[model samples]
Target chain A: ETVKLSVGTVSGNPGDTVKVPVTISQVSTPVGLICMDISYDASKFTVKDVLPNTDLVKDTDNYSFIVNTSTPGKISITFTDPTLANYPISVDGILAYLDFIINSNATAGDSALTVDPATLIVADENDKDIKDAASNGKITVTGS
Target chain B: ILGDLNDDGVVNGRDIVMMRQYLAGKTVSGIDKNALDINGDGAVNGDDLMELIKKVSNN
Candidate 1:
């Protein structure tokens, strides 16, 4: 079975901060790491922020996450731990939450929040890259 | 992989005994730590042995 990564679709008013969740499902194998670039329209959203799910990772003790927002319109993501075999995600659940502020001057329309397939990588404990599918989310900025 | 302990030709009851001894800290010869991690949970513990037994028996 193919594992799937999905970005939650959301709607928010201009100038309002919005939170979108990243979820994973259909996991039959232990996941060692997941790295990728989450792309968004900079003109509509700003100051990318990501928080890894603490329900699984405990105090960064066995897990670590990287959400680099240095480059506008792109956020580099990495979620992994030292012990590749331990604390692995065996079940399906939310992985992270992405928060962004809607651009105050942005036009009212739908924008895409995409997971760049070219840079997406989901590796297993045996250091093998597993086949995965990703869903690009769409967000609507409600305004006149 | 069938948890081939000791890098032996195949996995059998001996591998099971080795795994138990390894976890028991008895220090068995020809014991492969790599092969003992059958569950791949970063530790050579009882769970790995149980999973190995399941796989070996199923085979």
Candidate 2:
């Protein structure tokens, strides 16, 4: 099964807030849980929050998610729903929204948004590992 | 580092203003003198200001 994870493109000036969407596509199996780590340049931008998109998947009421931003430049996201373990989503849509504030001292450059391959985990309903591809994202910061 | 005259971790119009003051014979110490010398010249002068303007413009 082919599963793809990607982040949306974002651009803004210093001190501006931008929302980046993490999405999934080409899903070919029943996904029960998704756990991954996202990284960015902490000196250039600060992560404000991580908001999951309930409309992208099935059985939203039964799903539980955790987003950890304690570590600098890294965000940990884990989503699972025991009730929806048997009901998987096959459609392509956004999984979460990452809100960030561009640092006031941020220079004009591109800040890469990446996913950690070693910590990436996508499991099926049967608790089987699913191989997937990740497409990295970037945030362009413009000087004022 | 081309236009960071104050060494506050950023190059912006503030640094440009500092450079101007320095050129006008103001005693501004504790900053990285080499960082303000964008043109690699022996002295910090109007040429450095021009280069800093170019650098800031590019950013």
Candidate 3:
């Protein structure tokens, strides 16, 4: 059977700052080193990293960034994590997928994006060194 | 001509014989007199027969 995943929303406009929230669920076991790639159409826009939300240690929060658009067009967003790159995160585990949409002032239609299989690893439940990621997490993006 | 019963551009003798048989209510000869019917009226009656005669005479 195919596994299902979901990504949260990040709201914003051109020359505007916005925060995008992402969540992973349906994991049969806990996993670590979770990260995702964010992307968008570049013919009409550009995005800069405000910085990875590394405060996962002190605060449990969503990742945020400042974005700027150069024109009016649809932007695409995609999510990919390293753990699931070139290899499966685990043989058996539930990986969450994320979805994104960009609401801007310049266009009539909303830009939407969905990433398939937001890979999440199964954590070694017995390992005492499994660090919580709410403090030092990050979301990266690229342009097409 | 409008409707040449003989289909030879003329509706002469053969047409008259066919019409005679038709008027006598004889379905014999099966000459397909209706084939010359251009007006599409129900039967190959007086009008249709006249039309065919005119065609043959003209030719």
Candidate 4:
């Protein structure tokens, strides 16, 4: 059973807001937990907000969502479906969305939105890990 | 502690996956190899992972 976490590519202009969605797919087993560390160039943008998709993991007490930004250029997200009530989806879907404020003086290029290898954890109902791969994302800044 | 690989101060499911990723040869910023050596056998192996699992379960 192999599962992959991916960060979708997005683009925005200076002084603009960009939204990037994280997705999970290739799940052969029931996934109940996920811990992710997404990294980006802090100089290019600042993380404004993060919202977990209610479609996959409900926004309730039964589920826990922890977002950590103590470290610059890093966003640690942890999602736990303690009761397996709305998780372990076999179909591919959005896990969460990250909104960032593109800096007013950012460079006109792509900033990598990578899944930190050391902090990524995709687990199943039994706490069995099935993480196989991750696709890094890119955020392009448009305009002069 | 034996597990807190992320140093978040709680041995939960997060550390469990970090250990697995480490074992799988993923460089998690070259995590604290010393902290991961649970059994202190001078090596970080599956035994340490098992122990960490037990500790996480019991925690």
Candidate 5:
């Protein structure tokens, strides 16, 4: 009954770079724009880049993407396609890809990668909320 | 605190697994009950689990 946003679990050794995929599920309508803020341990990990799914905005010149890392330990990502703003994506699939590099000093353990719901804005073609729940992901740093 | 169920000074995959078991009505002891209240709602439940997961990652 609720639309869910989730991140895939990833594991790697310290100093490794990993790419984690963000996904949306249980969509009952078409999605137009998605804006979200993610938080992670800056000391243990560094965000390299955020890539939105190109398929979602393919052949559209109205698409816009913005990522901010001005603040430590947080990254903000926004995607909007004015031309397709009212178009709905009725299927559930990958929304974005996150690239991160684990700190060489990161201990062998789990680190939280979370979405800040306060800033998470998922809208349908009509600019209505489409997300009701979200699940955080974890990165397990293993010993080499 | 929520994820550090074993009071080992660290939250890891082991704590995540133990918390899952404890929340499932198992007999898990020696946990700092208050630490398990990750959400501070005065109850230890799935929400706390979520919070713990977030804490483990963010910190």
Candidate 6:
């Protein structure tokens, strides 16, 4: 199932902490495993494992996370629900998920892959979030 | 023989002491100043004294 995600306002200073709000929809119940991965222009940044928010219970809605801006440049946040066994939803800010494998499945590791943020979008004046997905998605950035 | 500055055919630490005595103006020089110049600088002055001190210090 294709889940839609919208990246809300994200503010962060260079080498400072940042909070990212993202709205996730069609989130599988029993909470499918989700992992957030970030990449900047083909260079991977970090892979974060997030547990299903039982307290913020909702199939599709807004959720937020505070992250440290260890890298400077545009970045793409993708969510992969490994249980869905498909590409994770790519958001504009800092967020992602990977489907969980319930059993021995062929698509075990193929559940998610994210494009480099510098390749997916350009940072706005804040140099925080992506402004465009199409044109920004293909552009390669050096040292991103 | 390395320390025999007077060429008295005897090698001992006393030769070095004798050279120090001449350098300090405590004794008169009747020996070859070149032989006393361990660094072969052609003159037995402060340079020779410093070189002898350096060699002794190394030990």
Q: Judged by DockQ, which candidate is best? A: 4
TM-scores of the models, in the order given: 0.68, 0.66, 0.30, 0.70, 0.65, 0.22
Candidate 5 per-residue lDDT, tens place, B6-58, comes to 79777643455456657767676666666787777788887876676555444
True contacts kept of each: 0.00, 0.00, 0.00, 0.04, 0.00, 0.00
Would candidate 4 be rated incorrect, acceptable, medium or high by CAPRI criteria?
A: incorrect
**Local accuracy of candidate 3 as per-residue lDDT tens digits, A67-121:** 2122233212211122222222333222322222322433423344333222221
Q: Candidate 4 — which residues are off by over 4 angstroms? A: A84-86, B1-12, B15-59
DockQ: which is higher, 4 or 6?
Answer: 4
What tens digits encode model 5's per-residue C-alpha lDDT throughout A23-66?
Answer: 88888867665666778889899888878787754423422455
DockQ of each: 0.02, 0.01, 0.00, 0.07, 0.02, 0.00
Better model by lDDT, 3 or 4?
Answer: 4
Q: What tens digits encode model 2's per-residue C-alpha lDDT throughout A1-144?
A: 668888888899998999999998888776766777789999999999888887865554533455668778988776655343345556778999999999999998788999988667777755466788788898999865
Task: Classify candidate 1 by CAPRI docking class.
Answer: incorrect
Candidate 5 chain A worst ten-residue window by lDDT: A57-66
> lDDT of all predictions, in order shown?
0.72, 0.74, 0.35, 0.77, 0.70, 0.34
With a 3 Å backbone cut-off (N, CA, C), the pairs that clash in candidate 4 are A31-A88
lDDT tens digits by residue: candidate 6, A19-53: 33334544332222222223322132222332333
Better of 3 and 4 by TM-score: 4
Q: Model 5 clash pairs?
A: A30-A88, A30-A89, A31-A89, A111-B57, A112-B57
Runs in model 5 deviating more than 4 A are A59-63, A85-87, B1-59
Alpha-carbon DockQ of candidate 2: 0.01
Q: Residue A81 of model 6: what lDDT?
A: 30
- Model 6: how far residue A136 lies from native, Å: 90
Q: Which stretches of candidate 3 lie over 4 Å from their true place?
A: A1-5, A50-106, A116-144, B1-59
- Model 4 lDDT per residue over A1-144, tens place: 568889999988999999999999887877767878899999989989888887776644533566667667988777766444444556789988999999888999888998988767777765567756788998999984
For candidate 1, what is the recovered fraction of reference interface contacts?
Answer: 0.00
Q: Where is the poorest 10-residue window by lDDT in model 2 chain B? A: B12-21
lDDT of 1 by residue, B1-59 (tens): 44788686665444554565566577677666667778777877778867755544444
